[PDB]
């Protein structure tokens, strides 16, 4: 019963999390690269982080 309840709660949370992102971009923004967020791409994470889709691939390399 506990496993079924946990599975139901997890499924409900997953369904709720879909299409509820509602993340916001600040007036002017940038990170890691330093130059400007709005010049290449919008790879954005939670807790307020910004990437160029290029600096991040440079980091992993």
């Amino acid at each position: 019963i506990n496993s079924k309840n946990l599975k139901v709660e997890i499924n409900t949370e997953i369904s709720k999390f879909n299409e509820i992102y509602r993340i916001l971009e600040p007036g002017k923004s940038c990170d890691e690269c330093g130059k400007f967020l709005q010049i290449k791409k919008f790879i954005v994470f939670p807790c307020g982080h910004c990437f160029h889709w290029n600096c991040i691939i440079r980091v992993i390399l």
């Binding site: 330093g34 130059k35 400007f36 010049i39």
Partner: protein, 613 residues
């Protein structure tokens, strides 16, 4: 201000700095002593009432040898707190001897002086807070400099050297659009470009270009601009551009090259363009000598404007920030002033008394000017116009010129300057004068106007104004009748004898080759280019100056509009009138831009003639 050149905002900073310095001098009754040359500039910025109310100073004086006799009369009297001199040492690198003799004789016990300088943007707002005591005195400024600059010659009397560096940056006076920098005269009223001593031209030219570069650097760093395209014309402009580029690339701080990477940069741009077209007056000596026909031009060559924009004979100020009648009539033609004034006067009749006083004063001044145009050697003001118009198109015959030069020499009385200017224009229009006419013209000149005229005709005969048919400084060596074919100066035009200035078409060709398309054209790289470019237009300017190197095009960034058209060698104010027409017609055609005319000082025909004398 902040990428938007709010020109009137420049005025407040200088006044605020001066007021703060004067009020921080001492909280007592002060007496001000101002240099004769700089005083008119100060009065054009701070009014007497505001000066009295803002700071406790109550007296202003002048640097003169009269003060030496008044040292026991004026200096001995008053002196409630101290004496605060104000000097200008930006040029001529020499303090006036008046203060030197007054210090030792009257034996002042407290010497404080004010010296002017351009804003040191490199100080970058005191550089934060000295980095928390320079991170443990890791940096220091004690003895890390030359002992003194210029003022090292002041090493006498006492140690009262409480110098105070009042800042100064260009601000507009004559009109909102155009600023003005005073770097064309010394304290001795000697021209900074045409000195009357043909032994030290090179140093004077170097000093002038250095000061102009310093002023441009100050303005550029104040407005935080990034020059992208440079179109240099002439020889001196090349050195000016190179020096400016080196100084910008050397003294710039950090935290902006990072912005220089973000903005502009590689493989991208943000659509911001500023142009720095630069010209020299020696390139086109054709049109500083023509007769003015606009209102302010006519009012200028008959009554000379001083450093401040005002006149001695009248009393009302011509400042544009408090009156609107002067705004709409300054640059209009003289003929279209009467009926406009009549309509303005009659419309107010149906309809505050300050407007009535303004219109009455303007009407009286216009009537006086109209009266003085006629009855004062009647017909000369028109005869010179017809003669100039005839000469510009070209109608000189064999030896007939000698008949007309003396025709108005004594039939109608006339000043020396008009004759000298007209003969200079005659010798310059044809690009060459034969060897069989100088022997008579010079003889008649030395006959009629003394012995010293030979020295004038010799010294003036090497700058290019007075040349004979039998480091080049970019003279002009092409017949003018040719230039009337490539260009359409003689057909839209005013402020002259119905002729378009040569600089006008020179700047026109950089953006739209329409008139050049009608004559001498079978193919062109473009018809409407936003960015300034020069290509396939070399031979025409190769023969026009004798060297295919006067034109310089420089791109600085690797990859609506503010154009800075400086003027090294004065602005003939008629060009300012046609600049607005250019802006309007270009905006109508599709290209939208804004022009700011940087001037080193108003230049005019007669004002030149006293210079080379």
């Amino acid at each position: 201000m902040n990428r938007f050149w709010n020109t009137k905002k420049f005025s407040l900073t200088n006044a605020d700095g001066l007021c703060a310095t004067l009020n921080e001098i001492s909280q007592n009754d002060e007496v001000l002593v101002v240099q004769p040359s700089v005083l008119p500039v100060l009065n054009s910025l701070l009014t007497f009432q505001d000066l009295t109310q803002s700071t406790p100073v109550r007296k202003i004086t002048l640097l003169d040898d009269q003060l030496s006799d008044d040292l026991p009369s004026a200096l001995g009297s008053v002196p409630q707190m101290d004496l605060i001199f104000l000097i200008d040492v930006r040029t001529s690198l020499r303090l006036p001897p008046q203060l030197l003799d007054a210090a030792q004789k009257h034996n002042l016990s407290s010497l404080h002086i004010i010296y002017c300088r351009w804003k040191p943007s490199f100080q970058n707002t005191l550089e934060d807070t000295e980095q928390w005591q320079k991170d443990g005195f890791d940096l220091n400024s004690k003895k890390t400099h030359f002992p003194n600059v210029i003022e090292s010659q002041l090493k006498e009397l006492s140690n009262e050297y409480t110098l105070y560096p009042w800042d100064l940056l260009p601000f507009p006076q004559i009109d909102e659009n155009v600023l003005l920098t005073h770097s064309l005269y010394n304290m001795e009223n000697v021209n900074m470009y045409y000195p009357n001593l043909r032994s030290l031209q090179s140093a004077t030219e170097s000093i002038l270009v250095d000061d102009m570069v310093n002023s441009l650097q100050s303005l550029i760093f104040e407005t935080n601009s990034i020059i992208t395209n440079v179109v240099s014309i002439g020889n001196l402009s090349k050195r000016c551009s190179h020096l400016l580029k080196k100084r910008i690339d050397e003294h710039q701080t950090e935290n902006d090259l990072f912005i220089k990477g973000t903005l502009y940069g590689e493989r991208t741009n943000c659509g911001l363009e500023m142009d720095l077209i630069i010209l020299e007056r020696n390139t086109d000596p054709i049109t500083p000598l023509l007769t003015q026909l606009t209102y302010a031009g006519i009012l200028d060559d008959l009554y000379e404007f001083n450093s401040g924009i005002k006149i001695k004979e009248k009393d009302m100020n011509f400042n544009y920030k408090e009156d609107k009648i002067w705004n709409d009539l300054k640059f209009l033609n003289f003929g279209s002033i009467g009926p406009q004034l009549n309509k303005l006067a009659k419309e107010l009749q149906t309809q505050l008394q300050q407007r009535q006083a303004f219109l009455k004063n303007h009407t009286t001044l216009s009537s006086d000017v109209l009266k003085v145009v006629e009855t004062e050697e009647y017909g000369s003001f028109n005869k010179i116009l017809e003669l100039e118009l005839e000469i510009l198109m070209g109608n000189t015959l064999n030896n007939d010129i000698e008949d007309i030069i003396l025709e108005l020499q004594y039939q109608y009385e006339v000043d020396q300057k008009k004759i000298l200017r007209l003969i200079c224009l005659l010798s310059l229009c044809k690009n060459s004068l034969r060897e069989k006419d100088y022997e008579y013209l010079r003889t008649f000149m030395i006959d009629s106007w003394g012995i010293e005229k030979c020295f004038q005709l010799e010294s003036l005969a090497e700058l290019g104004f007075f040349t004979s048919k039998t480091s080049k400084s970019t003279r002009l060596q092409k017949e003018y009748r040719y230039i009337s074919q490539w260009f359409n100066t003689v057909p839209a035009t005013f402020a002259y004898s119905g002729v378009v200035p040569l600089t006008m078409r020179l700047v026109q060709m950089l953006y739209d080759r329409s008139i050049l398309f009608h004559n001498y054209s079978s193919q062109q790289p473009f018809i409407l280019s936003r960015e300034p470019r020069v290509s396939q237009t070399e031979d025409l300017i190769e023969q026009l100056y004798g060297d295919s190197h006067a034109i310089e095009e420089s791109i600085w960034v690797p990859g609506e509009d503010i154009a800075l058209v400086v003027f090294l060698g004065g602005v003939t104010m008629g060009e300012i009138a046609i600049m607005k027409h250019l802006q309007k017609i270009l905006g109508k055609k599709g290209i939208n831009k804004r022009f700011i005319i940087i001037a080193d000082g108003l230049i005019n025909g007669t004002r030149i003639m006293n210079s080379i004398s």
